[PDB]
Symmetry: C2
Subunit: 146 residues, 2 copies
């Protein structure tokens, strides 16, 4: 799998949920209105994190195959974000957070984070593309962990 390897970088990993051998990362530029290629390409994994206040119940990581670079992204379920907005309006007012989102446009799995930054991930295995999309959607639409 890749549990130990990810464990080196994220000590809180509890269970690896999905991984694909080749995924390439891009970032949307709202000014130029285009996709900028980022320095990350390699193994892509999505995993459950032990978060017994860390709001990142899940994590997404891209580990470069030809160099040591790693890209890490936290995945926060909508329920956690909405709960913070309702029962913790103060902290949010200070550090405004919005619900993350995911969509498939063209060949890219597009993800919006808590700060409305948008990333694009290219995955070869077309079957993996749909699986990662459904998995992230599921992780965002349901109540945390298991």
């Amino acid at each position: 799998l890749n549990f130990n390897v990810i464990g080196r970088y994220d000590p809180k990993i509890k269970q690896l949920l999905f991984h694909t051998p080749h995924a390439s990362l891009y970032k949307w530029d709202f000014k130029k209105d285009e996709w900028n290629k980022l320095e990350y390409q390699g193994v892509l994994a999505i995993y459950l994190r032990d978060v017994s206040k860390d709001i990142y119940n899940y994590g997404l990581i891209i580990l470069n195959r030809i160099n040591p670079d790693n890209f890490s992204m936290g995945i926060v379920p909508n329920s956690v974000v909405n709960k913070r907005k309702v029962f913790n309006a103060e902290e949010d007012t200070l550090n405004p957070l919005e619900c993350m989102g995911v969509e498939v446009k063209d060949e890219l799995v597009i993800i919006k984070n808590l700060k409305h930054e948008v990333y694009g991930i290219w995955i070869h295995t077309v079957s993996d593309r749909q699986n990662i999309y459904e998995l992230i959607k599921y992780l965002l639409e349901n109540e945390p962990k298991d």
Copy 2:
């Protein structure tokens, strides 16, 4: 998923000389070797990789000497960026070193090279710069290596080959 591609001579819009497409693979990612830090630096190019024959013939009335008989190009799929590299046969570089040393001493050129190292196809520039190309289609790595090797080791070809 939705079909969007057209069968079109897109290379020709960036390099008018293309005369014959020799090889293409769907997904290839480009890296460059950094000698100072001894590591691969990821470059902003990934997409369709093609190797093609260029028309550098003098037997034409369209002329009022190009040494790049072949070309390699990577066309980004996610954005409009392209990476281009010319391919010159060793025999042409060697002849040049001897009978045109003046233009050489001004713009030094050495024999290019190619090898396959694990997952990468490694190409050495006419300037000794080293690039690494990760190709998704496994079998295409050996085939591109074989084609470039053949183009480098043989006499300049004007057509088919």
